Amino acid sequence: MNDAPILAKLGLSKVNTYYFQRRKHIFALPITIPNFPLAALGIFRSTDMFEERTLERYSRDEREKTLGKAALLLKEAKEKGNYSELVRLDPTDPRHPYYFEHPWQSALKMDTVSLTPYQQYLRWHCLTYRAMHEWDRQGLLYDDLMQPKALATDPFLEEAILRLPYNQRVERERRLSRAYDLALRREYLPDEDCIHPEDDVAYLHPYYHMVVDEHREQHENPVDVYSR
Amino acid sequence: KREWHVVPATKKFADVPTEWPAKEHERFALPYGPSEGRIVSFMRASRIRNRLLFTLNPTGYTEDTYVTKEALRRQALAESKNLWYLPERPVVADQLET
Amino acid sequence: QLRPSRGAYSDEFVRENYIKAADPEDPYNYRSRAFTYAAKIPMWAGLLAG
Amino acid sequence: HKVLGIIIMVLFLLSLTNLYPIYFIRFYNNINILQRSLLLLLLLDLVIASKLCLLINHYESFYLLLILSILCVLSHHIYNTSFNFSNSI
Ligand SMILES: CCCCCCCCCCCCCCCCCC(=O)OC[C@H](COP(=O)([O-])OCC[N+](C)(C)C)OC(=O)CCCCCCCCCCCCCCCCC
Numbered sequence: 242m243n244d245a246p247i248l249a250k251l252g253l254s255k256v257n258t259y260y261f262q263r264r265k266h267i268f269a270l271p272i273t274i275p276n277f278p279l280a281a282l283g284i285f286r287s288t289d290m291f292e293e294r295t296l297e298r299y300s301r302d303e304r305e306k307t308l309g310k311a312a313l314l315l316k317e318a319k320e321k322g323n324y325s326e327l328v329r330l331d332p333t334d335p336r337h338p339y340y341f342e343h344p345w346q347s348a349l350k351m352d353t354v355s356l357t358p359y360q361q362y363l364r365w366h367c368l369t370y371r372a373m374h375e376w377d378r379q380g381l382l383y384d385d386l387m388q389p390k391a392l393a394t395d396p397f398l399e400e401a402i403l404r405l406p407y408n409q410r411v412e413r414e415r416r417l418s419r420a421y422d423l424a425l426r427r428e429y430l431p432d433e434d435c436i437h438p439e440d441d442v443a444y445l446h447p448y449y450h451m452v453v454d455e456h457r458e459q460h461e462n463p464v465d466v467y468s469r
Numbered sequence: 470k471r472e473w474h475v476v477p478a479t480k481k482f483a484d485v486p487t488e489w490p491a492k493e494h495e496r497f498a499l500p501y502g503p504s505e506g507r508i509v510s511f512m513r514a515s516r517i518r519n520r521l522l523f524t525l526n527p528t529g530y531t532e533d534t535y536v537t538k539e540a541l542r543r544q545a546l547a548e549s550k551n552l553w554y555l556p557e558r559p560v561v562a563d564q565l566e567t
Numbered sequence: 568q569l570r571p572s573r574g575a576y577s578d579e580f581v582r583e584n585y586i587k588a589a590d591p592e593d594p595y596n597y598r599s600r601a602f603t604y605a606a607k608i609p610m611w612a613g614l615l616a617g
Numbered sequence: 618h619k620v621l622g623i624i625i626m627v628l629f630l631l632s633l634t635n636l637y638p639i640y641f642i643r644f645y646n647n648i649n650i651l652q653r654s655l656l657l658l659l660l661l662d663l664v665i666a667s668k669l670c671l672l673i674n675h676y677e678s679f680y681l682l683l684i685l686s687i688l689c690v691l692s693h694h695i696y697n698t699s700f701n702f703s704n705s706i
Contacts, residue, residue: 273643273698274632277693278625280691284692291649296703297703299703373650
């Protein structure tokens, strides 16, 4: 990870949070249909390790990490006086407190000495499972496939898109239209234009996470118990 | 009305630590992710199973007296009045969640 | 490749695969129109008889 | 058990729908190769279950495979629930 050295000095782990993922519950509630009855309970689960895992953002550890990085930025601003600059970094900057990295952005240059055999399997799986879907041959980034729906829309997602800078929004739309045109013929880009895994940047996950936190803010500081 | 007497501003925050990262980050390091093993994480998730987790050691602590490594690190940071330790809000739950 | 400037096919490609061969004696595509309408006739014929 | 069979039938038909959750926030993510492979498995299990259900009238040993196929059918995930991952208070 490009963020790792910072995480190194805050006493955190240099390894992606994609590892350490674990099952803590038996039943998955609230039960959601249209799963089949037994599957609706969630006793037996099928995962490909590429789920969003958004609800795990409601943790004290993640907040501590975010505030540690923010405190580093504020300390630098106090020393130098470039506060403005340091609070307007692009969320793809490793110093931004909400920096997020896909597991494959560092799977090729990972330490791999501290990984459990299960975690080594996870690394190999991340690379190969990315290769299988062939969104890298469509000239597309993974976050381009995070799109909202007409009904049951993902609210955060919509906001996450409106926070993008104008040029990045336009580039996202243009990539999506090119992928649409390619998909008409089920065509791929020339083999030299394949997306390298380290180029598959997660440019929308920081905005997504910031929106999630801002939406939970008012819940934890209620005006009153029976308040909208 | 005319003469402006001088008073110190941040006198309270003098001699308090101003280093960041601090010493605690070196002595509560967690280079291997969460400090709890997978099975343990599964036990502490349920209030019932949690009771079964601490009763396996009759001479061990209880739910109200067990502290995790992350909690120890946060308490250590809080105690040392570091200037740059911005405290984090614990996850607050409404009725149904509880 | 992350800042596109083109769709799927380049002009050259489309000029070699999709565009019909030119007929200098027929600059108004009477041949194409005649063929397409004649080829539509059997569809209408089958539907009518059916 | 007849009552249990009726209950399972009603629950099956009701769980094919998407009427719950009603007011909890839910949204649908993408689909992947694993889900498509499991969909093929669902098709296989349904067909085998039909054939075996009709065969068991003369051959008692096929009850094992009929029950196995029905169990495999009843535990098929159509909607991958983001509630599979969360923390505890
Ligand atoms: C009205 C609803 C919408 C219809 C839209 C169009 C549907 C798709 C196109 C039609 C496809 C089928 C064409 C069949 C033609 C061949 C048979 C035929 O007519 O033979 C002529 C010949 C003509 O016989 P004849 O007796 O006149 O010939 C003279 C013979 N000598 C002198 C020796 C006695 O046979 C008949 O007409 C027999 C009676 C009518 C047979 C009808 C066949 C089935 C028609 C429906 C098939 C379509 C799918 C099912 C639809 C069901 C709807 C309820």
